[PDB]
Design a protein around this ligand. Structure first.
Ligand SMILES: C1C2CC3CC1CC(C2)C3
Lengths: 155, 21
């Protein structure tokens, strides 16, 4: 039983699903509902801005990757591992990684490859949880994610 | 993988933006 993995997969898969289909999953989040719910809401807020702001960089990258099937998704995971290969980890890289995943997920749906969205979410979660588990733990997992992106209203 | 650094840099831009929020 790996709660950190389960929670991460739940958050990331639901964002990619709702981005691809355009409809939220109105089931409540699983055990540990508070953190996961705020994490997904934060992901919508920050992730949507990332895709809007950087739609150019995302579109160019997707065009060159030429993603067509589940094989191209596994090759995609190879590129994603390089997100931390310079020794640096932060929430900005992690949210950008997930945002591109949603961008790819939308593309996978318009080419009638919705079956690859679930593998895509699992790959992203694998990269995060299986190679950066220690860093996530030190941040307090998705609680750290929520707090970092919380915007302070200091009047 | 030659695109790797692009997303790292974009990620650091996003992180540096919120780092003052
Ligand atoms: C470009 C691509 C998307 C995000 C950000 C940046 C590095 C890696 C690949 C993750």
């Amino acid at each position: 039983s790996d709660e950190l993995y389960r929670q991460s997969l739940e958050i990331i898969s639901r964002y990619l699903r709702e981005q691809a289909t355009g409809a939220k999953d109105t089931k409540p989040m699983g055990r540990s509902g508070a953190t996961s719910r705020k994490a997904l809401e934060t992901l919508r807020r920050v992730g949507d801005g990332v895709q809007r702001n950087h739609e150019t960089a995302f579109q160019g990258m997707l065009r060159k990757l030429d993603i067509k099937n589940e094989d191209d998704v596994k090759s995609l995971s190879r590129v994603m591992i390089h997100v931390f290969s310079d020794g640096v980890t932060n929430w900005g890289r992690i949210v950008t990684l997930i945002s591109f995943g949603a961008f790819v997920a939308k593309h996978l749906k318009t080419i009638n490859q919705e079956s690859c969205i679930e593998p895509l979410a699992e790959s992203i979660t694998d990269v995060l949880v299986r190679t950066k588990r220690d860093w996530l733990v030190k941040q307090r997992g998705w609680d750290g994610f929520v707090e970092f992106f919380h915007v302070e209203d200091l009047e | 993988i030659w695109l790797a650094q692009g997303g790292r840099r974009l990620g650091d831009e996003i992180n540096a933006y919120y780092a003052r929020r």
